Design a protein around this motif. Structure first.
Motif, PDB file in Angstrom:
ATOM      1  N   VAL A 119      47.193  31.858  40.510  1.00 61.00           N
ATOM      2  CA  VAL A 119      48.235  31.300  41.752  1.00 61.00           C
ATOM      3  C   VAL A 119      49.950  31.839  41.447  1.00 61.00           C
ATOM      4  CG1 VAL A 119      48.631  29.000  41.212  1.00 61.00           C
ATOM      5  CG2 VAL A 119      48.452  30.075  43.687  1.00 61.00           C
ATOM      6  N   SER A 120      50.072  31.714  40.082  1.00 62.59           N
ATOM      7  CA  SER A 120      51.659  31.917  39.885  1.00 62.59           C
ATOM      8  C   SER A 120      51.645  33.268  39.736  1.00 62.59           C
ATOM      9  CB  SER A 120      51.793  31.089  38.513  1.00 62.59           C
ATOM     10  OG  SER A 120      51.629  29.623  38.626  1.00 62.59           O
ATOM     11  N   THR A 142      39.327  28.667  63.310  1.00 66.59           N
ATOM     12  CA  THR A 142      38.828  29.814  62.815  1.00 66.59           C
ATOM     13  C   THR A 142      37.545  30.541  63.394  1.00 66.59           C
ATOM     14  OG1 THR A 142      37.423  28.439  61.100  1.00 66.59           O
ATOM     15  CG2 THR A 142      39.741  28.883  60.570  1.00 66.59           C
TER      16      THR A 142
ATOM     17  N   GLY B  12      58.466  31.972  48.152  1.00 68.12           N
ATOM     18  CA  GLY B  12      59.684  31.748  47.224  1.00 68.12           C
ATOM     19  C   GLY B  12      59.169  31.530  45.715  1.00 68.12           C
TER      20      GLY B  12
ATOM     21  N   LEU F  10      55.181  23.414  63.644  1.00 63.79           N
ATOM     22  CA  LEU F  10      54.366  24.619  63.012  1.00 63.79           C
ATOM     23  C   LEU F  10      55.205  25.937  62.990  1.00 63.79           C
ATOM     24  CD1 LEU F  10      51.872  26.237  63.260  1.00 63.79           C
ATOM     25  CD2 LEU F  10      51.968  26.459  65.906  1.00 63.79           C
TER      26      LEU F  10
HETATM   27  C1  LIG Z   1      41.284  29.039  60.210  1.00 64.79           C
HETATM   28  C2  LIG Z   1      42.564  28.814  59.817  1.00 64.79           C
HETATM   29  C3  LIG Z   1      43.413  28.023  60.876  1.00 64.79           C
HETATM   30  C4  LIG Z   1      44.799  27.896  60.555  1.00 64.79           C
HETATM   31  C5  LIG Z   1      45.204  27.289  58.981  1.00 64.79           C
HETATM   32  C6  LIG Z   1      46.574  27.613  58.525  1.00 64.79           C
HETATM   33  C7  LIG Z   1      46.764  26.521  57.548  1.00 64.79           C
HETATM   34  C8  LIG Z   1      47.678  27.128  56.515  1.00 64.79           C
HETATM   35  C9  LIG Z   1      46.855  28.067  55.762  1.00 64.79           C
HETATM   36  C10 LIG Z   1      47.678  28.515  54.414  1.00 64.79           C
HETATM   37  C11 LIG Z   1      48.292  27.441  53.667  1.00 64.79           C
HETATM   38  C12 LIG Z   1      49.021  27.717  52.270  1.00 64.79           C
HETATM   39  C13 LIG Z   1      48.069  27.996  51.215  1.00 64.79           C
HETATM   40  C14 LIG Z   1      48.316  29.379  50.550  1.00 64.79           C
HETATM   41  C15 LIG Z   1      47.854  29.319  49.044  1.00 64.79           C
HETATM   42  C16 LIG Z   1      48.367  28.225  48.321  1.00 64.79           C
HETATM   43  C17 LIG Z   1      49.010  28.433  47.117  1.00 64.79           C
HETATM   44  C18 LIG Z   1      49.789  29.716  47.233  1.00 64.79           C
HETATM   45  O1  LIG Z   1      49.297  30.858  46.788  1.00 64.79           O
HETATM   46  O2  LIG Z   1      51.101  29.781  47.873  1.00 64.79           O
HETATM   47  C19 LIG Z   1      51.396  30.933  48.036  1.00 64.79           C
HETATM   48  C20 LIG Z   1      52.306  30.998  49.315  1.00 64.79           C
HETATM   49  O3  LIG Z   1      52.819  29.754  49.758  1.00 64.79           O
HETATM   50  C21 LIG Z   1      52.601  29.320  50.931  1.00 64.79           C
HETATM   51  O4  LIG Z   1      51.811  28.313  51.169  1.00 64.79           O
HETATM   52  C22 LIG Z   1      52.873  30.481  52.192  1.00 64.79           C
HETATM   53  C23 LIG Z   1      51.697  30.445  53.085  1.00 64.79           C
HETATM   54  C24 LIG Z   1      51.933  29.986  54.545  1.00 64.79           C
HETATM   55  C25 LIG Z   1      52.144  28.520  54.610  1.00 64.79           C
HETATM   56  C26 LIG Z   1      52.537  27.938  55.694  1.00 64.79           C
HETATM   57  C27 LIG Z   1      51.610  28.194  56.973  1.00 64.79           C
HETATM   58  C28 LIG Z   1      52.178  28.303  58.142  1.00 64.79           C
HETATM   59  C29 LIG Z   1      51.343  29.225  59.346  1.00 64.79           C
HETATM   60  C30 LIG Z   1      50.063  28.528  59.274  1.00 64.79           C
HETATM   61  C31 LIG Z   1      50.117  27.546  60.648  1.00 64.79           C
HETATM   62  C32 LIG Z   1      50.445  28.239  61.636  1.00 64.79           C
HETATM   63  C33 LIG Z   1      50.569  27.250  63.023  1.00 64.79           C
HETATM   64  C34 LIG Z   1      49.338  27.432  63.483  1.00 64.79           C
HETATM   65  C35 LIG Z   1      49.154  28.844  64.128  1.00 64.79           C
HETATM   66  C36 LIG Z   1      48.270  28.904  65.254  1.00 64.79           C
HETATM   67  C37 LIG Z   1      52.590  31.255  46.807  1.00 64.79           C
HETATM   68  O5  LIG Z   1      53.255  29.673  46.674  1.00 64.79           O
HETATM   69  P1  LIG Z   1      54.557  29.661  45.875  1.00 64.79           P
HETATM   70  O6  LIG Z   1      55.410  28.512  46.142  1.00 64.79           O
HETATM   71  O7  LIG Z   1      55.323  30.860  45.819  1.00 64.79           O
HETATM   72  O8  LIG Z   1      54.233  29.605  44.038  1.00 64.79           O
HETATM   73  C38 LIG Z   1      54.666  30.494  43.446  1.00 64.79           C
HETATM   74  C39 LIG Z   1      53.492  30.940  42.461  1.00 64.79           C
HETATM   75  N1  LIG Z   1      53.851  30.999  40.855  1.00 64.79           N
HETATM   76  C40 LIG Z   1      54.303  29.708  40.502  1.00 64.79           C
HETATM   77  C41 LIG Z   1      52.799  31.285  40.067  1.00 64.79           C
HETATM   78  C42 LIG Z   1      54.958  31.849  40.830  1.00 64.79           C
END
Ligand SMILES: CCCCCCCCCCCCCCCCCC(=O)O[C@@H](COC(=O)CCCCCCCCCCCCCCC)COP(=O)(O)OCC[N+](C)(C)C
Ligand SMILES: CCCCCCCCCCCC(=O)SCCNC(=O)CCNC(=O)[C@H](O)C(C)(C)COP(=O)(O)O
Lengths: 243, 76, 109, 46, 67, 615, 84, 51, 47
Positions: A119-120, A142, B12, F10
């Protein structure tokens, strides 16, 4: 896993349900038992798999078997949910197998234990994989939930035992789906055999965008899809049923 | 994060803290306000409120549907 | 005889037993004021004999001590949070030593 | 296996305490009559 | 970019893949295969068929043959 | 105005997670806090427009599933019960977001935390405001997912991954139960909407054919709903995930593992009040499980020596009393306890998190000793929280914690005396451990290491204002709400609750109860305080550390390991299913017998049959 | 996270062995072994290591805890750990 | 601040101890006032003029 | 105390006292020194 698995179900919905209505009733319990035992056995088998491909191939089998429970439960809810879950699976399984394909085309492992804590390193693919395996869970909002719950409702209109086992199928489906998600995208990295590896380029980040939009469009507003089929489904269920 | 500065990290990285985030924060608030205006317009457009309030509430300043559902016979 | 290899395991066994018994009685004694007499009695117990010479009165004694220690484990012993078993080990671990991430992949020709 | 008996024994304490509540018969020692309401105990309201 | 693929993994992976060479119809495993191959399908089949029969009994309609 | 409350969190989370790079590690946090704060402000506006100005507003966006009379829609239900839950959930969420700006300031992944909690808040707002089961099920599964995500916040923690997975397991068992209940509603009333089942839930009295025998529908549906809510409400069936789920960050354990999702099932069963009311069989098991859990958590929580784990058992005890108060057809008292608890329990966790942040995360009461004057503000905060937990007389805790037992006695059934006994007994254990927390920490000669003492660093401004607000809440909210929610016939639940005329023990309780019982919880609390003082400050040479051989130390292991139930359940269900998932299927099925006599095992006789026809 | 140097450690490490009264707090050296030079038992040695454990918050694994019978090894081990 | 023999602690902030003391005083006052007003009501000493 | 290890523990951790925090028993209820005074002044002031 996107089309060929639909031939059997579509063939059932075309040349089996209408032409042989009372034969369908007489063979109804047998199909219920087969589908329930398939769901349970596949669910228990898929949670001890190390092959990167079969882990979701068995999920496809479980979903297709759950389809027949409401497909053979003559009902407007059952059949409508059958086709909705069929399209939902045709999208979600395709997305999962594309994710497995992109994972394999970089590292060329075809295992599950090699990958871990990436993931990182690939955050975009992490989010996309999370959304796809999240749809496989059958969350409301979904694609899979509306169809699959409609199948459960339709079967519970007819019978009260077998589709309770169908619902018990998802008590483990979601469990092993998130467990499988946590094999790969979670934990500390192991840079002993993962020296260099990249994230999705412009092609395979855009390829999922139709999948994402279709998935959310299924989830939040499936009325347009149900609108075009309620005539055909109702005609199908009432054929040879004069009274 | 020695290598973690090479990933895009859509939400981020480990510790990003960009050079100019306050302007991004301000434009984010402006965008949220602009996108929630139509939500407010739609909410004021559809709200039944079958019963009249006992005292004048901060409502009925943008909502015009009040006591419009005490006619529960001509309902589709 | 005159081989310290056979006499070895006794010494490290009893020393490690003293260490773990001290840890477990510290777990038992939340207050240090009452921990003083407990530790004094614990060290006296290991010093009760302190004079064994024979090879018959060494293995049975340590086996009995270890077996009695098996009855007192204090299911929740204290662990340092960043130690391997604490509340902060592997919380925000340092990134691994060396990995590289390429940029141009899946291009044309 | 030893931990299993505690679950049966622990639940045995509760059903044993549950049996005590059965033997106590709290239901029949009410200091009050059943409630009375106007309009045939709200028959039209029900 | 290809993984190192250390030698102590592919052997177990192929053993999981090539498990078809270890089966000799042992009696305990024969009972194990027989029960989950026949009895549980039979038990569940009786469950659904009797559920249908009890549902039809209350409505008063005659029971379908259900061959 | 009313659509805004559920979509500000949201939208804010969506933008702060998609473009978290733009807003950085602090802009995202401050903007999420801003959005949830204005959501809470409009929640207060809605509370004034709905609660005081009693007129429920109903708005419908668009049908969700427009099939044969399964018209689940995006409509919203804003009644008195909805608004009182909103003014809790969004207010606590906003204050926890304020608390987490400074608490989650040294951590790298700041924006992801904010976006996670904000989507979770959106999900729970959808849950609370939902007009039908499917929307309620949507919010319910969403909040379960978000709880799993926050437990999995530190992905690299191997223990946290397992804890989150087990939490997902128990939540999915609850999903099974609640989905079966929801669908069973449709097969009876041909609807899932709240306003149709409530309007017509008394007419049917038929029995179904539910797969083993003939059972009444309403009783079966209520039992299925209880089986659904056991996982969410943390009841006797499956509640092993709370103590093991404390491996996540403190604020989420502060925000949510103590305030609303643990009571999400409580709010769900209160919302469907005129469905549990017609099944007297169900209320029996509701009260039974409530007493069972209120006793289990209180007994298991007395020997714990972990800061963040010992209070989870207290939260489970509170859930037990809430379920008991639900089973007495007096959900108004249950929601009164809910609103009282959401203040002081969250205050206790926030004060504990403030302490643990300053002492470099040393959550072991074996270590912290007397440095109360070092942390006076947090000491006052958690003192208020714990005193409200006790039910201190003429405080926000007394107005519910004594009334619940008083109502428990006034009902005369077999399980009523049992549940009353358990509720009375649990007071002693609850007070004992809630006072041992204040005794072994900040009130005994110090045992903490010098490296932690030298740090000091009192809680800054960001995580002290929410503490102040929760302190001023859990000192006057109970008094200001006692009259206006349960006023012996108040006009606050016109459509939110249905009070059965027969099971209506409110008027007779206050007057026919003896004076002695109205004071015995106080005596039990004082006895527990004195016992804690004796075993933690005076008589601790044998009452605190007993060097017993057998039959007494096993008692120490019994309460500490939670009756060994965390081990029996694992080895007897999870281990068994893990073994038999492969042992039977992958060995004696699939590839195997269907292969040896199938494609190429032994049916490939043609290879052996090739050299016999050329003769 | 100051990464205190050795000169900031050579005093607190010596404090516990100076406070040890069974041996004179006058012939103690940063490089000394308690088994021969200072004449200690085989049991009281781990007491000083544990006292260091409370002095500096760090869990030393049971495997090599008993191998530290010289004062040089204790300070070296606490300095070698980064998060000490 | 100052060290005893190797341990030094920062002085607690003025804006923390003062608020803690004052807020404890005001909640004690509120508790005692509530005891003065409706104390006999919950202890059965006198009923709230309803009989 | 005596016992060849209890005294050893006591000697090194004599800093555990730190008189300001050796016995925080005076401040169990920090606001009771002023709260009761305010309450009694109001009691005699309103009357
Ligand atoms: C059927 C689906 C229904 C809707 C469900 C939506 C729920 C959210 C779904 C996504 C949740 C986030 C999970 C993403 C994977 C978690 C781990 C990951 O990869 O995170 C990413 C991205 O992080 C995120 O979570 C961003 C994704 C968006 C999260 C917010 C979701 C908001 C929109 C969904 C809900 C909208 C409202 C409903 C829409 C009708 C990177 O995280 P960093 O902080 O950058 O870590 C850096 C990695 N490293 C340390 C190695 C450098
Ligand atoms: C609930 C359970 C009930 C309570 C359980 C209580 C458990 C009590 C356990 C008691 C076990 C013992 O006594 S353990 C006591 C073991 N004592 C010995 O072995 C003395 C050996 N002495 C020597 O070798 C030499 O004199 C010398 C090398 C100088 C010393 O160095 P060492 O020291 O390195 O050996």
């Amino acid at each position: 896993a996107g089309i060929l698995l639909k031939f059997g179900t579509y063939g059932f919905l075309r040349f089996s349900i209408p032409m042989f209505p009372e034969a369908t009733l007489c063979f109804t319990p047998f199909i219920y038992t087969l589908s329930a035992i398939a769901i349970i056995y596949t669910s228990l088998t898929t949670l001890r798999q190390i092959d990167l491909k079969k882990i979701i191939a068995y999920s496809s089998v479980a979903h297709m078997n759950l389809v027949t429970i409401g497909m053979f439960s003559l009902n407007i809810q059952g059949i409508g949910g059958s086709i909705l879950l069929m399209l939902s699976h045709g999208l979600v399984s395709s997305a999962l197998f594309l994710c497995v394909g992109v994972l394999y085309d970089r590292h060329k492992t075809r295992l599950v234990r090699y990958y871990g804590g990436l993931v990182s390193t690939m955050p975009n693919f992490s989010t996309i994989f999370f959304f796809f395996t999240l749809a496989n869970m059958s969350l409301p909002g979904t694609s899979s939930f509306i169809g699959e719950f409609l199948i459960l409702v339709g079967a519970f209109q007819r019978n009260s035992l077998v589709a309770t086992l169908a619902a018990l199928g998802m008590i483990l489906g979601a469990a092993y789906s998130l467990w499988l998600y946590n094999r790969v995208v979670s934990g500390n990295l192991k840079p002993d055999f993962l020296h260099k590896f990249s994230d999705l380029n412009g092609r395979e980040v855009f390829i999922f965008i139709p999948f994402l939009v279709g998935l959310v469009w299924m989830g939040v507003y499936p009325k347009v899809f149900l609108d075009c089929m309620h005539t055909s489904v109702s005609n199908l269920v009432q054929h040879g049923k004069f009274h | 994060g020695d290598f973690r500065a090479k990933v895009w990290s859509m939400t981020g990285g480990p510790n990003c803290r960009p050079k100019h985030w306050r302007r991004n924060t301000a434009i984010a608030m402006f965008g949220v306000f602009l996108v929630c205006i139509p939500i407010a317009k739609l909410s004021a457009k559809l709200e039944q409120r079958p019963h009249m309030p006992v005292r004048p509430i901060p409502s009925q300043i943008w909502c015009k549907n009040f006591g419009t559902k005490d006619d529960y016979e001509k309902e589709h | 005889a005159a081989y310290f290899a056979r006499r070895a395991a006794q010494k490290e066994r009893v020393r490690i037993l003293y260490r773990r018994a001290l840890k477990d009685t510290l777990n038992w004694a939340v207050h240090r004021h009452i921990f003083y007499r407990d530790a004094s009695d614990l060290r006296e117990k290991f010093n009760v004999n302190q004079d064994v010479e024979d090879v018959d009165r060494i293995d049975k004694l340590i086996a009995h001590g270890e077996a009695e220690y098996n009855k007192w484990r204090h299911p929740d012993p204290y662990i340092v949070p960043w130690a391997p078993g604490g509340s902060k080990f592997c919380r925000n671990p340092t990134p691994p030593a060396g990995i590289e991430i390429v940029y141009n992949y899946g291009l044309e020709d | 296996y030893e931990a299993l008996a505690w679950l049966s024994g622990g639940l045995g304490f509760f059903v044993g305490l549950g049996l005590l509540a059965v033997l106590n018969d709290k239901a029949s020692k009410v200091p009050f009559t059943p409630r009375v309401y106007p309009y045939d105990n709200l028959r039209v309201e029900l | 970019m290809e993984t190192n693929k250390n030698k102590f993994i592919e052997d177990w992976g192929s053993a999981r893949e090539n498990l078809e060479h270890n089966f000799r119809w042992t009696r305990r495993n024969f009972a194990l295969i027989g029960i989950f191959g026949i009895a549980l399908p039979i038990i569940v089949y009786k469950g659904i068929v009797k559920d249908f029969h009890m549902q039809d009994e209350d409505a008063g309609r005659p029971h379908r043959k259900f061959l | 105005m009313y659509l805004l409350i559920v979509f500000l969190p949201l939208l804010g989370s969506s933008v702060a997670g998609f473009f978290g790079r733009f807003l950085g590690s602090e802009g995202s946090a401050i903007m999420t806090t801003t959005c949830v704060s204005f959501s809470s402000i409009l929640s207060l506006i809605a509370f004034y427009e709905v609660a005081l100005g009693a007129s429920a507003c109903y708005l419908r966006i668009a049908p969700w599933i427009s099939s044969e009379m399964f018209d689940a829609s995006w409509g919203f239900l804003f009644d008195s019960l909805t608004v009182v839950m909103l003014i809790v959930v969004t207010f606590i969420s906003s204050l926890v977001h304020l608390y987490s700006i400074s608490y989650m300031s040294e951590d790298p992944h700041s924006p992801r935390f904010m976006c996670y909690l904000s989507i979770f808040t959106f999900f729970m707002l959808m849950l609370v405001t939902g007009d039908n089961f499917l929307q309620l099920f949507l919010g319910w599964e969403g909040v379960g997912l978000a709880s799993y995500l926050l437990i999995h916040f530190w992905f690299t923690r191997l223990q946290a991954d397992k804890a989150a997975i087990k939490a997902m397991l128990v939540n999915r068992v609850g999903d099974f139960g609640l989905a079966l209940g929801i669908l069973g509603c449709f097969t009876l009333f041909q609807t899932v909407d709240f306003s149709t089942i409530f309007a017509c839930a008394s007419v049917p009295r038929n029995s179904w054919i539910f797969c083993n025998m003939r059972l009444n529908a309403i009783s079966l549906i209520c039992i299925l709903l209880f089986i659904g809510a056991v996982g969410k409400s943390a009841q006797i069936g499956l509640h092993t995930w709370l103590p093991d789920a404390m491996e996540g960050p403190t604020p989420v354990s502060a925000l949510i593992h103590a305030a609303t999702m643990v009571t999400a099932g409580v709010f769900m069963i209160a919302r469907c009040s005129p469905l549990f009311e017609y099944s007297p069989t169900a209320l029996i098991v509701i009260t039974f499980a409530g007493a069972m859990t209120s006793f289990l958590a209180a007994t298991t929580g007395i020997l714990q020596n972990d800061l963040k784990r010992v209070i989870a058992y207290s939260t489970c005890s509170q859930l037990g009393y809430m379920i008991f108060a639900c089973g007495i057809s007096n959900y108004s008292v249950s929601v009164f306890h809910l609103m009282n608890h959401a203040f002081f329990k969250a205050l206790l966790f926030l004060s504990a998190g403030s302490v643990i942040h300053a002492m470099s995360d040393e959550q072991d009461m074996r270590k912290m000793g007397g440095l109360a004057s070092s942390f006076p503000l947090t000491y006052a905060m958690m003192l208020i929280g714990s005193l409200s937990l006790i039910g201190f007389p003429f405080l926000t805790g007394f107005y519910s914690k004594d009334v619940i037992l008083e109502l428990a006695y006034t009902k005369y059934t077999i399980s009523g005396n049992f549940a009353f006994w358990l509720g009375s007994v649990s007071v002693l254990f609850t007070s004992y451990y809630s006072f041992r927390l204040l005794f072994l920490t900040f009130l005994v000669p110090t045992n903490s290491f010098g490296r932690d003492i030298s740090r000091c660093h009192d809680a800054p401004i960001p995580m002290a204002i929410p503490l102040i607000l929760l302190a001023l809440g859990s000192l006057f909210v109970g008094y200001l709400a006692k009259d206006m929610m349960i006023g012996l016939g108040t006009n606050f639940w016109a459509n939110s609750l249905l009070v059965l005329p027969k099971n209506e023990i409110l008027a007779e309780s206050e007057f026919a109860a003896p004076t002695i019982i109205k004071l015995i919880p106080i005596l039990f609390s004082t006895l527990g305080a004195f016992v804690a003082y004796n075993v933690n400050l005076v008589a601790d040479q044998f009452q605190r550390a007993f060097q017993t051989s057998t039959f007494c130390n096993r008692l120490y292991s019994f309460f500490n390991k939670r009756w060994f139930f965390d081990q029996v359940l694992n080895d007897f269900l999870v281990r068994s299913f893990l073994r038999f998932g492969y042992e039977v299927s992958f060995e004696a099925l699939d590839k195997g017998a269907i292969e040896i006599l199938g494609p190429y095992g032994i049916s490939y006789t043609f290879r052996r049959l090739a050299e016999r026809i050329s003769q | 996270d100051d990464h205190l140097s050795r000169e900031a450690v050579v005093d607190r490490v010596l404090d516990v062995v100076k406070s040890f009264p069974k041996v004179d707090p006058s012939k103690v050296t940063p490089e000394v072994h308690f088994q021969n030079d200072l004449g200690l038992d085989s049991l009281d040695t781990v007491e000083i290591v544990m006292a260091i454990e409370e002095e500096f918050k760090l869990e030393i694994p049971d495997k090599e805890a008993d191998k530290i019978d010289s004062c040089s090894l204790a300070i070296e081990y606490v300095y070698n750990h980064p998060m000490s | 601040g100052i060290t005893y023999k190797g341990v030094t602690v920062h002085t607690p902030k003025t804006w923390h101890t003062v608020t803690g003391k004052g807020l404890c005083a005001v909640m004690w006052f509120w508790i005692l006032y509530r005891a003065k007003q409706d104390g006999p009501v919950v202890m059965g000493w006198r009923h709230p003029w309803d009989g | 105390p005596l016992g060849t290890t209890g005294e050893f523990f006591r000697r090194r951790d004599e800093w555990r006292k730190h008189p300001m925090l050796s016995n925080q028993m005076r401040h169990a209820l920090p606001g009771i020194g002023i709260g009761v005074g305010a309450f009694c002044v109001y009691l005699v002031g309103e009357q």
